Subunit: 115 residues, 4 copies
Amino acid sequence: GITGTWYNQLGSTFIVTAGADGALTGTYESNAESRYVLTGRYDSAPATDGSGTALGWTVAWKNNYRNAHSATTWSGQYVGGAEARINTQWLLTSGTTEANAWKSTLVGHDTFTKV
Amino acid sequence: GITGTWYNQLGSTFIVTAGADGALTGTYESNAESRYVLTGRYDSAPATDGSGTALGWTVAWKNNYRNAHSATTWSGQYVGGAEARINTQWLLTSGTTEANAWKSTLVGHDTFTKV
Amino acid sequence: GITGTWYNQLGSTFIVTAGADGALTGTYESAVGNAESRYVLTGRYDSAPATDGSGTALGWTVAWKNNYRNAHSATTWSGQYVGGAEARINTQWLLTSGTTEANAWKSTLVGHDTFTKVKP
Amino acid sequence: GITGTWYNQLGSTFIVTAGADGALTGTYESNAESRYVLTGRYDSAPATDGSGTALGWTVAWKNNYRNAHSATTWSGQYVGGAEARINTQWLLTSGTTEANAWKSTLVGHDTFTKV
């Protein structure tokens, strides 16, 4: 259910493989200059009462072409069924000096679908 | 610098290895029954201006003894200096039904040190 | 056009008046949680926003205590109003329950709400 | 416990009156130029178990002299006694265009004391 290609509504696309050990690994494409490594974890033996599957991943925004000095972690759940969704909240953290530490983190949410 | 053993106020311990091209691997404990796998990423080429090093990691709270059907993601930055510390904000998502999604996700923060 | 009656995706109703001094005053009625009947709200908004088509920053608070019950908790919504055809307010919110020191790590929930003047 | 002047480590100062209704009213100072109105709510009947006292408040960052086109909300709790403190998580949202909303909200924490 998780393994595959997921789209948000801003044109972003990620491809993930959900491993039996509970590993999540893939590529987030914000172009080869826009592709980044993702890595995370998921609940590999979820409850079967209609609850969703807890998961999370991280992208550090560096590849072989560019570097944003920042990272995004998404925390959320997979909802199967009808048309599957991954509903998430995210944190974006940027490298800053001590003095700008207070404005280092952005918070948001994102929903991914299989189409 | 990142590589090593870290602690938080509440006495949890996390062991990381920072890979030369941005990977993070390790364990998070709070005894082996409290040991879980972490995985994440970091900026392997941070600014030279005194800024910190962005990073993130995830833990799914399942091991071979336990499953709380939830996962936590930490987004933050490593600050090398007088005292090396990792300053984070985090998100804990639980698997919930669609009716309870609204109360699925906790938010907090955590400071890690090597001491 | 912030003043008025607003609905979120889960059918909660927010009745608010935007005054001249940047004040936000009203009532909230939730469709979920340890809740029943109206709760008092107060907040602030930017009463002289930019012209560039940026939205209007705003915020408000509800403590979940009325004459019928007390959930020992408060939510704050932080967001922006976007005017026009289908007007709307997009928010991220934080819900803090009172806890003892030991349980404080789990005292805050975070979430996102979207309000529209039409009920879903 | 709550009415009076509170200070963060940042320097910022906030003076509040907690009314019997559960109203919070006051000013947030960082000179007139840096003074802003705050309004909020608190639980005027907290449990007795030793649970802190839930509150929140908002400041829109406009006064007669400047306008940042932004608003911050603090969600947190009051913990009384000698080292009485208010612990909060905050959100700061900036008015942005639709294209830019994904980066409109910052998150962080702050701790307020009486000294």
